[PDB]
Amino acid sequence: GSHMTFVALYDYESRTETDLSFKKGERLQIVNNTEGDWWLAHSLTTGETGYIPSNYVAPSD
Ligand code: NI
């Protein structure tokens, strides 16, 4: 709940208001994971927030 972050595996460009654009290697907090395919995430690396494809991240663990 504050102990885990995820790492971006690939670059992703959002053209939607609510998606997050990110680069591979960013450190992300998962905010909402109620759905399996799209998660609300916050990038600690950029300070930006938005939905991400869950297949584009893996736990940093
Ligand atoms: Ni935690």
Author numbering: 81 to 141
Manuscript excerpt for this entry:
The non-receptor c-Src tyrosine kinase participates in different signaling processes by phosphorylation of tyrosine residues in a variety of proteins, modifying their properties, such as enzymatic activity, subcellular localization and stability. Of all those, the SH3 domain plays a key role in the regulation of the tyrosine kinase activity through the recognition of an intramolecular Proline Rich Motif (PRM) and, additionally, through the interaction with other PRMs present in other proteins.
The structures of the monomeric form of the WT (WTM) and Gln128Glu mutant (Q128EM) of the c-Src-SH3 domain were solved from crystals belonging to space group P212121 with two molecules in the AU. In both monomeric structures, the side-chain of residue Glu106 in chain A (Glu106A) is hydrogen-bonded to Ser123A side-chain and two water molecules, thereafter W1 and W2. However, in chain B, Glu106B side-chain is hydrogen-bonded to Thr125B side-chain (2.8 Å) instead of Ser123B side-chain (distance between Glu106B and Ser123B is 5 Å). W1 and W2 molecules linked to Glu106B side-chain are also maintained, but not W3: the latter is present in the WT structure, but not in the mutated one. In the Fyn-SH3 domain, and in the c-Src-SH3 Gln128Glu mutant, the presence of two negatively charged glutamate residues in the folding nucleation site would result in the electrostatic repulsion among the residues buried in the hydrophobic pocket. This repulsion might favour the intermediate-like structure in chain B, where the glutamate side chain is oriented outside the pocket formed by the distal loop. Remarkably, the mutation of glutamine by glutamic acid results in a change of the pH where amyloid fibril formation occurs: Gln128Glu mutant develops amyloid fibrils at neutral pH but not a mild acid pHs. The case of the Gln128Glu mutant amyloid fibril formation is different from the WT protein as it takes place at neutral pH where the protein is monomeric even at high concentrations (>20 mg·ml−1).
